[PDB]
Amino acid sequence: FQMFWLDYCEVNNTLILFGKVKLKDDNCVSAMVQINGLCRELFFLPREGKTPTDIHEEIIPLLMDKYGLDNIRAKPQKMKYSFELPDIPSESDYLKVLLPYQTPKSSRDTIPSDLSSDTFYHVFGGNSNIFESFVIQNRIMGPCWLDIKGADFSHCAVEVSVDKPQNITPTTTKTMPNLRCLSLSIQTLMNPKENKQEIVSITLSAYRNISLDSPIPENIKPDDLCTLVRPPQSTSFPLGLAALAKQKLPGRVRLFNNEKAMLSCFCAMLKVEDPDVIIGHRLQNVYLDVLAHRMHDLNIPTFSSIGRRLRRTWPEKFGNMNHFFISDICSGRLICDIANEMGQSLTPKCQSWDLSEMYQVTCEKEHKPLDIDYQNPQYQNDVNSMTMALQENITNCMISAEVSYRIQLLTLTKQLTNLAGNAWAQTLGGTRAGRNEYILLHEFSRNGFIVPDKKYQGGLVFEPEKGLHKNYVLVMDFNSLYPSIIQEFNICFT
DNA sequence: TGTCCCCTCGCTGCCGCCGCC
């Protein structure tokens, strides 16, 4: 069973991977694989004078009694530690014990690292997360093809369960499927009564076939364009909106009465279409936040369509922790926020990172932004104002999608993910410490090293000879000073 | 669960405090 994984989620001490699978007719559809039996990689560090056999004979009976396990896989293993903890020998033989994430009893208590005993005085790898454990032990390096054997038959077309993380092994295939991309554009208003922002119009620009192997053509037309419109002030739209929308507004325009029906129809379209990638401009910081809050307040039973996991209940703590909550709900669909830290990192020439400015910078095409304030009754009496605002929403969605493909946000993030070994969404979010952490994790784990469990003077600047220098002057720089320094003097943790 | 993007240096504007010519 071959699957190209995209994102992950954790629940009930199990890890679930979201990806695409070729059918018999090699058609690519969404898939979900729930993987059981994932287990923690423990290391017991013996005290001076004791051996892993003593740690075995002492602790494994206690561990089997404690976790209610029939048997526990464990073996002495020589391992190297070269990190910041003191009293840890440079090389010692450890008792490499294997503890499943899901145990019959007391499944969510982690063995303390500082745990002392007569045989050992330290434990390593006791609080590692499920995704870390799988991505390290099975040597997964970013999104890549995945061979699954003994598959046992969410908002994914295929649902798969496997009880052994081993059968799941990465392939050598560098070719990767076509992506279902759905760009988003959102228009909001604050209501003075409750002082909350409310969704007015949502634009859905679908790009069903995007292949990151070959280059993306410029200004590709979306395979489908649909819009969802809500009465901003009154409950009745100005007469003639539908006919004018069909005569002028591009794509389909479907019209509503209230916010609840609009969000329900949005959820239905999201579930039916099943994007792989969600484009947008300031989506994660603003638009996804307001979308989720409006979804929760209006009590839509299908809020889980924004991701690929099927949730009947909203997490109870929802109501500055909303970032993680949104990231967890939207698990399955990548958020390609063109204005986030990664997006800003790929366009340092912009000053405000507004949609118009970034369009002008990346695509060299000028668009004049229009200020839409639906609080003005111009959009409840006039129909031309409503259709102009809808046209602006369509234009914003198209611009966001096009500039997203212009900078290869997805392609760069995928390449750096396969370089780092983290997940695609995490590096899409703009992190830099996560990629470094995971590349070091993979490199040190593959070389028999014990990975650690989860203010100084800088460079020297000279005083300039301030003034004008009419003679020819040269610039003499060091190509990547710090990396070539670390290679030069062989600076390392080890 | 709850995270992050090295500190540190030098540069400019603003604000409040102190002494002075």
Added chain:
RNA sequence: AGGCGGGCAGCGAA
């Protein structure tokens, strides 16, 4: 009104 000393915040750069 002006120069200096310590403090905060904002930001461009290595």
